[PDB]
């Protein structure tokens with residue numbers, strides 16, 4: 001009720017910027033507001049360390065971040081995803 005950040009907006013922002021091969025967003029919204037966990041497989045993470053990956057994801061949802069209580073993520077390249085056997 002009255003929240004403008006949703007799992008759908010998060011999904012759309014991530015898809016728009018990161019064009020993932022695989023995305024699983026968990027809606028973890030609760031007492032303190034909107035919150036999500038994002039499992040993201042994207043070629044956009046190739047050539048980047050984990051902090052630089054996190055930066056890229058946060059930059060996708062920069063406009064929404066002040067309205068997000070918590071956001072957690074796991075960022076893999078499609079190569080790493082295949083090597084951890086998905």
Ligand SMILES: [Mg+2]
Pocket residue numbers: 065068069070071
């Ligand atoms: Mg927050």
